[PDB]
Design a protein around this ligand. Sequence first.
Ligand SMILES: [K+]
Ligand SMILES: [K+]
Ligand SMILES: [K+]
Ligand SMILES: [K+]
Lengths: 306, 306
Amino acid sequence: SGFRKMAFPSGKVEGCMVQVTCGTTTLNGLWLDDVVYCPRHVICTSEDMLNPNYEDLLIRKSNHNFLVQAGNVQLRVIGHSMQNCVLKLKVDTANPKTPKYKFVRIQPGQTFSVLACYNGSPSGVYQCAMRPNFTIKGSFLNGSCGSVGFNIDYDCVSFCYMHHMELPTGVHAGTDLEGNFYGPFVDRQTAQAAGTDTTITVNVLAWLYAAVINGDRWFLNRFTTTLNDFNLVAMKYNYEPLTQDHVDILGPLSAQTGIAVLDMCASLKELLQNGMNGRTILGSALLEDEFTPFDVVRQCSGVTFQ
Amino acid sequence: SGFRKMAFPSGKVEGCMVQVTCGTTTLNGLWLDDVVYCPRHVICTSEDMLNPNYEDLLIRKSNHNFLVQAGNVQLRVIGHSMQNCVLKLKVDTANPKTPKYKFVRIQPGQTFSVLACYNGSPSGVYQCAMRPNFTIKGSFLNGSCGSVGFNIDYDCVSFCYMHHMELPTGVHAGTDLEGNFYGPFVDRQTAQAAGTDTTITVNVLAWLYAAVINGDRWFLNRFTTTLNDFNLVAMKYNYEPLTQDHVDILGPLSAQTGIAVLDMCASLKELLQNGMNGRTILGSALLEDEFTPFDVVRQCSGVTFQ
Ligand SMILES: [K+]
Ligand SMILES: [K+]
Ligand SMILES: [K+]
Ligand SMILES: [K+]
């Protein structure tokens, strides 16, 4: 039945994307009700970026400094405020296409769909994971800033990511929609080290469950392990520790397949130690770690979105 | 920076997905104007499937045998016809969300976005390739039939695929939206061998160009080759022949990178012969072949969609 990097449908988010211009910067903004959210670095010139005082830069801005275009329609900015690193432009018009939404702060490991936009217009949609070092390995160009990551539960869009910058290593960094960066990053043009990246253990397990649901059973082995002995081996291969919360979230998949998490863990231990012997799991020769337990359930059980 | 399996935004297609029920079979249909398109095997019982006479089964169907639900809204079927393997249900209501669209028959190697649906509701969106054996390596479950593949050019949705069946090997087969199967497949429960699957050479090349644009240069080697000497090696590794047309299509990427196609070919030759030596290209330990030259340009140049 197959298994793919599968994104949410983008329709609900497409209707919220606007173009926001200030000074020499055009990026994207998120139009929900009568508010447009965008990265506040839109207010900076090249020179401001080196050491911005955002409180002072904003005081010196006026509503008229901001041009927001929604399609062929200029939105008039009637107010402006700043929440952490997100700029909130109050506009004259509530988006008639505002979906049900929440703003959620996700954890490292968790995945979301990205709607990459340029000039307020969607370019494409792809699935991403928040890396343990709070970066995301996006596909973003110049003008992508303001693009958002989201999940959908039933009819509710949970916005969890807004893109702010690309680091020198080519990976991306951003905020929740309350404006707080994921990770030790600041919206300043100053050198900033991503922490060292690790592998999202709980996701690799989830993906192995996915492999079992799709028939692949070769990696199932006769060994068993304790959580602690597993985490010792994990550590050595630059894997995130497996928590009890992780074991609990894998519960559904363990019940669906009948294979216990610690059993699956022992199978992963051996994959880590010995390798794959030129075999593949779900078409991959590497252990894939950008699928959450929930992502697997949703793809393997057929969860739809209203 | 970065490179992902990136699907078109699904919004324009989300509004066309309906639920079509007939007897006990529920699948998806495509609601464009006052017509709903779905796979005609929806009219078959388990027993009909073994050797259906579709002309006769349909004559014995009535408009009232078909339940079409669009959201929480029953569409009344007021007519039914059959085009090859697609059922066309005339309904009382033109879809108010019908986009600009064409129905296009794609060729093997070309890619498209799939909006996987169940019960007329989208589950996810992902990028796919028409395999050289006219199958697609989808992610589809029971009830996915009627789900469509599409591309978007400016504001126009080109529908190119409608899902009809899964083969025993777990790969999928379907029709264009005129109802003609891709490949030697029939909407009948009779054994059907997919031809042997080969690798889409021109796409692997395009993806290597993508790798070069994203900095990866290790696989570039000092060798060069003739097209014919390349195709001899390709054959041995189950790669599609490289045509002159393929070399011409890769022109843009060859110009962007400055690496000539035959030069890139020699780099692929070596990858095929020697392997990767535990190195990776764009995070992958396998040669990826589900990105067209155009897909690479589009993602690396940032083309948007309205
Ligand atoms: K600016
Ligand atoms: K075991
Ligand atoms: K495409
Ligand atoms: K070369």
